[PDB]
Design a protein around this ligand. Sequence first.
Ligand SMILES: CCn1cc(NC(=O)C2CCC2)cn1
Length: 185
Amino acid sequence: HHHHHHMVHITLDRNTANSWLIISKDRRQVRMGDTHQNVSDNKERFSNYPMVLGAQRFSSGKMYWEVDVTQKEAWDLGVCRDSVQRKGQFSLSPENGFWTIWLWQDSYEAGTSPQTTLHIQVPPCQIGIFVDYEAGVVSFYNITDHGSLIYTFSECVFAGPLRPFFNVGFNYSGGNAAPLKLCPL
Ligand SMILES: CCn1cc(NC(=O)C2CCC2)cn1
């Protein structure tokens, strides 16, 4: 791909984070803590899952960023509406305001309804995410495999401002403690 020149500097929004997440000083890394991280509750925090939003809001243009997923067993990545549900149980779908892919139990899937199997020969260590607001496109790229396409959501109905979306996943296994990291430009 040739989307690198739309690179944007993403930072994480602490106020949206599940109360167990630990965000680095530079707001570029996030991991699951082993306990509640001693913050007050608020209506923005994702309550049920280890999710957090980027601070940036996008309503036009083309945007690109990269995320490091090295040695994780489970994670979700993509974008979502600013007004997505924060509390209780929900599925990641375009109907609910999410455009995402994930790793779960050694398989990669796109968050369609129902979910779509992805075909990845080289397990990615870094994922590129491209958003074209006007075109209604969200695309995912395998940076480990020379930028190869993973998945394209087209005919997207954003219906609001978009925010970068992250889920570090649970760590029931003891094998999923590693962080998500926003990679430098
Ligand atoms: C909540 C509004 N809404 C949006 C959609 N569909 C999409 O965004 C497309 C991406 C692939 C299907 C369905 N309902």
